[PDB]
Amino acid sequence: CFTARMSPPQQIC
Amino acid sequence: NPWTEYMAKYDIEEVHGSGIRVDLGEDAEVAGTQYRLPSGKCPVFGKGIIIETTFLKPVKDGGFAFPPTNPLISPMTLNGMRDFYKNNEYVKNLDELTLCSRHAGNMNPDNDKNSNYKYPAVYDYNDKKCHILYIAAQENNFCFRPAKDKLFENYTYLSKNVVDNWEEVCPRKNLENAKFGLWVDGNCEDIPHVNEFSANDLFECNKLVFELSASDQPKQRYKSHGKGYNWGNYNRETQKCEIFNVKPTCLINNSSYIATTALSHPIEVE
């Protein structure tokens, strides 16, 4: 899993 | 010096500022541990990683690239990226290389706290795909090494720091009928000392320059900061790759020569 730094922040797994 | 503005992009120490063969010019902390990571400001045209499985496969049965995700953010096409960031005006119109770099830098491995670690990436001009590299390692002599190769000619190695105006300030094309020189008292003089390597064509000369270029890791305190044998004068008639490690400050018109750099594309000329 990763976390988007730019808006919108979200979790990509 | 009338060549000052034109020759700016060939001050690789200034415009790139990191290793080329092996780019590990910065450090970043991930959950209490410092890691080395690429930080070159220029794209490296034709650079890939040879595994001795290709390195663009998702991370011995895997490669260096990001594992599959939901949604799939790697690999992602150029149109896929522009659609993904269609609401972000600061991103959606970036060139393919910078956009790929920013896309890779958008993925934070530290899901607990915001960190500085940003993955490198490879943009493939062949199918217009951005591959986010999960593995930032570039040489281990599971052994592997960085190289320019015919198979890699459309690959482009991108660090997190690739500037959005690389087209203006970074090398890409090789200079046909031109020879790198040093401007002295109103005249462009030859590079006083060069290291001559034999090369069959321009590709092999560019390949050799890359092998000898700035590297942030010894083959087989480590930071080059762009310093190294980054330039080459290829005499196509004598088939000599004249390699040197000081920045050129002018051009000499000579139909026997093609001016190349370790960052430059191994084929394209202008």
Side-chain angles (χ1 to χ4, degrees), chain B residues 231-245:
Chain B
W231 310 262
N233 282 331
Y234 181 60
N235 190 321
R236 65 205 308 180
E237 300 175 10
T238 68
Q239 295 193 138
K240 292 188 178 186
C241 192
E242 301 165 17
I243 306 174
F244 55 98
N245 61 345

Side-chain angles (χ1 to χ4, degrees), chain B residues 1-4 6-28 30-33 35-56 58-59 62-69 71-110 115 117-127 129-140 142-149 151-219 222-270:
Chain B
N1 191 7
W3 288 97
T4 299
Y6 179 90
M7 294 303 295
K9 60 168 57 62
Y10 298 105
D11 191 350
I12 288 178
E13 187 174 344
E14 176 56 51
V15 295
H16 186 64
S18 191
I20 296 180
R21 182 184 186 272
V22 174
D23 186 352
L24 289 172
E26 275 185 24
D27 305 279
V30 189
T33 292
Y35 299 93
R36 311 190 66 193
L37 81 171
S39 66
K41 294 184 291 184
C42 292
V44 194
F45 294 97
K47 173 179 178 177
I49 308 296
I50 299 179
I51 304 176
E52 337 175 270
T53 311
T54 66
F55 84 111
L56 287 191
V59 67
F64 282 47
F66 258 42
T69 49
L72 193 64
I73 43 92
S74 186
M76 191 172 245
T77 67
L78 183 56
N79 294 338
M81 289 194 298
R82 295 202 191 280
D83 177 67
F84 188 83
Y85 298 103
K86 65 183 180 179
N87 296 320
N88 194 333
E89 62 271 45
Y90 307 105
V91 172
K92 70 179 187 178
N93 284 319
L94 290 170
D95 69 85
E96 69 281 349
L97 297 191
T98 309
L99 174 55
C100 182
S101 177
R102 301 302 182 266
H103 178 58
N106 191 29
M107 313 304 170
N108 184 20
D110 199 329
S115 77
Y117 196 97
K118 297 181 175 184
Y119 295 94
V122 172
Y123 187 76
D124 187 357
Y125 276 109
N126 183 41
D127 50 18
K129 288 183 192 303
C130 175
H131 303 262
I132 312 180
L133 298 183
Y134 181 78
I135 296 175
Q138 293 153 69
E139 178 161 71
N140 180 229
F142 190 62
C143 299
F144 48 92
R145 62 183 173 88
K148 298 219 185 170
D149 188 271
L151 299 177
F152 300 156
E153 76 168 68
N154 284 316
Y155 293 169
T156 313
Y157 198 90
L158 314 163
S159 93
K160 63 188 193 61
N161 286 344
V162 172
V163 294
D164 53 45
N165 65 329
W166 62 265
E167 290 175 35
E168 301 172 347
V169 301
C170 292
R172 184 195 173 112
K173 310 256 179 193
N174 305 285
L175 306 180
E176 196 170 30
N177 303 315
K179 182 183 191 179
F180 283 139
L182 290 172
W183 190 264
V184 168
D185 291 326
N187 201 81
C188 192
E189 308 292 336
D190 279 321
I191 309 294
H193 177 62
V194 297
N195 302 269
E196 296 190 352
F197 290 73
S198 57
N200 195 49
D201 52 29
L202 176 63
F203 202 112
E204 297 298 332
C205 177
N206 179 264
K207 187 178 300 184
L208 283 171
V209 173
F210 176 82
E211 280 291 340
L212 301 178
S213 62
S215 189
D216 302 337
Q217 167 182 321
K219 277 166 184 171
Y222 287 141
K223 298 182 175 71
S224 65
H225 303 290
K227 299 181 185 296
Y229 293 87
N230 307 323
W231 310 262
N233 282 331
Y234 181 60
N235 190 321
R236 65 205 308 180
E237 300 175 10
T238 68
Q239 295 193 138
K240 292 188 178 186
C241 192
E242 301 165 17
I243 306 174
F244 55 98
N245 61 345
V246 302
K247 72 170 184 181
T249 53
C250 53
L251 293 188
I252 298 168
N253 178 237
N254 193 318
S255 56
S256 302
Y257 279 92
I258 306 177
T260 190
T261 81
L263 294 173
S264 302
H265 192 268
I267 300 184
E268 295 175 11
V269 301
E270 72 170 16

